[PDB]
CSV table of C-alpha atoms in Angstrom, one decimal:
chain,number,residue,atom,x,y,z
A,1,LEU,CA,27.7,48.0,52.3
A,2,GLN,CA,30.1,45.5,50.7
A,3,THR,CA,27.6,43.0,52.1
A,4,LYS,CA,25.2,43.2,49.0
A,5,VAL,CA,28.2,42.7,46.7
A,6,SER,CA,28.6,39.1,48.1
A,7,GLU,CA,24.9,38.2,47.8
A,8,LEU,CA,25.1,39.2,44.1
A,9,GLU,CA,28.4,37.3,43.5
A,10,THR,CA,26.7,34.1,44.7
A,11,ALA,CA,23.6,34.9,42.6
A,12,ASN,CA,25.8,35.3,39.4
A,13,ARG,CA,28.1,32.3,39.9
A,14,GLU,CA,24.9,30.3,40.5
A,15,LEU,CA,23.3,31.5,37.2
A,16,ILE,CA,26.4,30.9,35.0
A,17,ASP,CA,26.7,27.3,36.5
A,18,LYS,CA,22.9,26.8,35.8
A,19,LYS,CA,23.5,28.0,32.2
A,20,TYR,CA,26.2,25.3,31.7
A,21,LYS,CA,23.7,22.6,33.0
A,22,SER,CA,20.7,24.0,30.9
A,23,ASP,CA,22.9,24.1,27.7
A,24,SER,CA,23.9,20.4,28.1
A,25,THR,CA,20.2,19.5,28.8
A,26,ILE,CA,19.3,21.2,25.4
A,27,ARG,CA,22.2,19.4,23.7
A,28,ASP,CA,21.1,16.0,25.2
A,29,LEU,CA,17.3,16.6,24.5
A,30,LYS,CA,18.1,17.4,20.8
A,31,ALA,CA,20.2,14.2,20.5
A,32,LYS,CA,17.5,12.0,22.3
A,33,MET,CA,15.0,13.5,19.8
A,34,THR,CA,17.0,12.8,16.7
A,35,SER,CA,17.1,9.1,17.6
A,36,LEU,CA,13.4,9.1,18.4
A,37,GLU,CA,12.3,10.7,15.0
A,38,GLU,CA,14.6,8.2,13.2
A,39,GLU,CA,12.8,5.4,15.2
A,40,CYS,CA,9.3,6.8,14.4
A,41,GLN,CA,10.3,7.1,10.6
A,42,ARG,CA,11.4,3.5,10.7
A,43,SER,CA,8.1,2.3,12.1
A,44,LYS,CA,6.2,4.5,9.6
A,45,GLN,CA,8.0,2.6,6.8
A,46,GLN,CA,7.5,-0.7,8.6
A,47,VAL,CA,3.7,0.0,8.7
A,48,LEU,CA,3.6,0.9,5.0
A,49,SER,CA,5.6,-2.2,4.1
A,50,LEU,CA,3.2,-4.4,6.2
A,51,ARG,CA,0.1,-2.7,4.5
A,52,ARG,CA,1.6,-3.4,1.0
A,53,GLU,CA,2.3,-7.1,2.1
A,54,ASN,CA,-1.3,-7.4,3.4
A,55,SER,CA,-2.8,-6.0,0.1
A,56,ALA,CA,-0.6,-8.5,-1.8
A,57,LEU,CA,-1.8,-11.5,0.3
A,58,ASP,CA,-5.4,-10.3,0.0
A,59,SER,CA,-5.1,-10.2,-3.9
A,60,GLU,CA,-3.4,-13.6,-3.8
A,61,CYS,CA,-6.2,-15.1,-1.5
A,62,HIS,CA,-8.7,-13.7,-4.0
A,63,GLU,CA,-7.0,-15.4,-7.0
A,64,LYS,CA,-6.6,-18.6,-5.1
A,65,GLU,CA,-10.4,-18.7,-4.3
A,66,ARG,CA,-11.2,-17.7,-8.0
A,67,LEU,CA,-9.1,-20.6,-9.2
A,68,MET,CA,-10.6,-23.0,-6.7
A,69,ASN,CA,-14.2,-22.4,-7.7
A,70,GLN,CA,-13.1,-23.1,-11.3
A,71,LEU,CA,-11.5,-26.5,-10.2
A,72,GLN,CA,-14.5,-27.5,-8.1
A,73,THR,CA,-16.7,-26.9,-11.2
A,74,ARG,CA,-14.2,-28.9,-13.4
A,75,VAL,CA,-14.3,-31.8,-10.9
A,76,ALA,CA,-18.2,-31.9,-11.0
A,77,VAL,CA,-18.1,-31.9,-14.9
A,78,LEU,CA,-15.5,-34.8,-14.9
A,79,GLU,CA,-17.4,-36.8,-12.2
A,80,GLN,CA,-20.6,-36.6,-14.4
A,81,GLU,CA,-18.6,-37.7,-17.5
A,82,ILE,CA,-17.5,-40.8,-15.6
A,83,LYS,CA,-21.1,-41.7,-14.4
A,84,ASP,CA,-22.4,-41.3,-18.1
A,85,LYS,CA,-19.5,-43.4,-19.5
A,86,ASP,CA,-19.9,-46.2,-16.8
A,87,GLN,CA,-23.7,-46.3,-17.6
A,88,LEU,CA,-22.8,-46.6,-21.4
A,89,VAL,CA,-20.4,-49.5,-20.4
A,90,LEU,CA,-23.2,-51.0,-18.3
A,91,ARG,CA,-25.9,-50.8,-21.1
A,92,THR,CA,-23.4,-52.4,-23.7
A,93,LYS,CA,-22.7,-55.3,-21.2
A,94,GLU,CA,-26.6,-55.7,-20.7
A,95,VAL,CA,-27.2,-55.9,-24.5
A,96,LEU,CA,-24.6,-58.7,-24.8
A,97,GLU,CA,-27.1,-61.2,-23.2
B,1,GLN,CA,37.0,49.8,48.1
B,2,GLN,CA,34.8,53.0,48.5
B,3,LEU,CA,32.7,52.4,45.3
B,4,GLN,CA,29.6,50.1,44.8
B,5,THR,CA,29.9,50.4,41.0
B,6,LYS,CA,30.4,46.6,41.1
B,7,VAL,CA,26.8,46.4,42.4
B,8,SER,CA,25.4,48.3,39.3
B,9,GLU,CA,27.5,46.0,37.0
B,10,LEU,CA,26.7,42.9,39.0
B,11,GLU,CA,22.9,43.8,38.8
B,12,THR,CA,23.0,44.5,35.0
B,13,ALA,CA,24.9,41.1,34.5
B,14,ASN,CA,22.5,39.2,36.8
B,15,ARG,CA,19.2,40.6,35.2
B,16,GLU,CA,20.7,39.7,31.7
B,17,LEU,CA,21.4,36.0,32.9
B,18,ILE,CA,17.8,35.8,34.5
B,19,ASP,CA,16.2,36.9,31.2
B,20,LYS,CA,18.4,34.4,29.3
B,21,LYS,CA,17.4,31.7,31.8
B,22,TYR,CA,13.7,32.4,31.0
B,23,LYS,CA,14.4,31.7,27.3
B,24,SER,CA,16.6,28.6,27.9
B,25,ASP,CA,13.8,27.2,30.2
B,26,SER,CA,11.1,27.5,27.6
B,27,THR,CA,13.4,25.9,25.0
B,28,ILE,CA,13.8,22.9,27.5
B,29,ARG,CA,10.0,22.9,28.2
B,30,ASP,CA,9.3,22.9,24.4
B,31,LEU,CA,11.9,20.1,23.6
B,32,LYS,CA,10.5,17.9,26.4
B,33,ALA,CA,6.9,18.5,25.1
B,34,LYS,CA,8.0,17.8,21.4
B,35,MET,CA,9.5,14.6,22.7
B,36,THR,CA,6.4,13.4,24.7
B,37,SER,CA,4.3,13.6,21.6
B,38,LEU,CA,7.0,11.8,19.6
B,39,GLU,CA,7.2,9.0,22.2
B,40,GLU,CA,3.3,8.7,22.0
B,41,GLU,CA,3.5,8.7,18.1
B,42,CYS,CA,6.2,5.9,18.2
B,43,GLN,CA,4.1,3.9,20.7
B,44,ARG,CA,1.0,4.2,18.4
B,45,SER,CA,3.0,2.9,15.3
B,46,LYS,CA,4.4,0.0,17.5
B,47,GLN,CA,0.8,-1.1,18.1
B,48,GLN,CA,-0.1,-0.5,14.5
B,49,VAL,CA,2.9,-2.7,13.4
B,50,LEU,CA,1.9,-5.5,15.8
B,51,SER,CA,-1.7,-5.3,14.6
B,52,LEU,CA,-0.5,-5.6,10.9
B,53,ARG,CA,1.9,-8.5,11.8
B,54,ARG,CA,-1.1,-10.4,13.3
B,55,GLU,CA,-3.1,-9.7,10.2
B,56,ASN,CA,-0.2,-10.8,7.9
B,57,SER,CA,0.2,-14.2,9.8
B,58,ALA,CA,-3.6,-14.7,9.4
B,59,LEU,CA,-3.5,-14.1,5.6
B,60,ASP,CA,-0.4,-16.2,5.2
B,61,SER,CA,-2.2,-19.2,6.9
B,62,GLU,CA,-5.2,-18.5,4.8
B,63,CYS,CA,-3.2,-18.4,1.5
B,64,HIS,CA,-1.5,-21.7,2.6
B,65,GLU,CA,-4.8,-23.5,3.1
B,66,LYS,CA,-6.1,-22.2,-0.2
B,67,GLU,CA,-2.9,-23.4,-1.9
B,68,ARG,CA,-3.3,-26.8,-0.1
B,69,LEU,CA,-6.9,-27.3,-1.3
B,70,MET,CA,-5.8,-26.3,-4.8
B,71,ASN,CA,-3.0,-28.9,-5.0
B,72,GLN,CA,-5.7,-31.5,-3.8
B,73,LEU,CA,-8.1,-30.4,-6.6
B,74,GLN,CA,-5.5,-30.4,-9.3
B,75,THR,CA,-4.5,-34.0,-8.3
B,76,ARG,CA,-8.3,-34.9,-8.2
B,77,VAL,CA,-8.8,-33.5,-11.8
B,78,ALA,CA,-5.7,-35.5,-13.1
B,79,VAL,CA,-7.1,-38.8,-11.5
B,80,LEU,CA,-10.6,-38.2,-13.0
B,81,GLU,CA,-9.1,-37.3,-16.5
B,82,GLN,CA,-7.2,-40.6,-16.4
B,83,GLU,CA,-10.3,-42.6,-15.4
B,84,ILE,CA,-12.0,-41.1,-18.5
B,85,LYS,CA,-9.1,-42.0,-20.9
B,86,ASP,CA,-9.0,-45.6,-19.6
B,87,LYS,CA,-12.8,-46.0,-20.0
B,88,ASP,CA,-12.8,-44.4,-23.5
B,89,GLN,CA,-9.9,-46.8,-24.5
B,90,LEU,CA,-12.0,-49.8,-23.2
B,91,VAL,CA,-15.0,-48.4,-25.3
B,92,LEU,CA,-12.6,-48.0,-28.3
B,93,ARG,CA,-11.2,-51.6,-28.0
B,94,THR,CA,-14.8,-53.0,-27.8
B,95,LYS,CA,-15.8,-51.0,-30.9
B,96,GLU,CA,-12.6,-52.4,-32.7
B,97,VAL,CA,-13.5,-56.0,-31.9
B,98,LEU,CA,-17.1,-55.4,-33.1
B,99,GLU,CA,-15.6,-54.4,-36.5
B,100,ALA,CA,-13.0,-57.2,-37.0
């Protein structure tokens, strides 16, 4: 009789107490997620920053190499100019005999 | 205490809580799933950052060696350009004596 009233009072008090717990779980999950998407956004910007830095270094390595081949060519030209001038200095010394 | 109207009221209150509990549970299941993908996404960008930091250190060392060989060459050019000037001046002074 009044027996089923008690089984139902326990069931209700249990549901309301579970509703408090589920609500705080939702509040906690939403907060744990806000920090997480702020973290993911930070690393996305960090990746993009590092990709820009890498492109910059790549272009810089290209220019350095371009300038280097130019200097190696310049050295070869000057090294030959020396050889030709030393030989001219040698032939002048040789004629004064 | 002769009326079970509290049963009819306690059953309409309970069935309403049970239906709300289904909705709250799927919200929790959906938040937990949205978070698992997000944690996986963050882990993927962490490895992408680390990969890009390795790559950056490599390019930096490479740019440093290129800059080092360039300073060496610029110095070499200056030495050779001076050797030329000194030899041309010797050739000039010999020409000058052969005139006087």
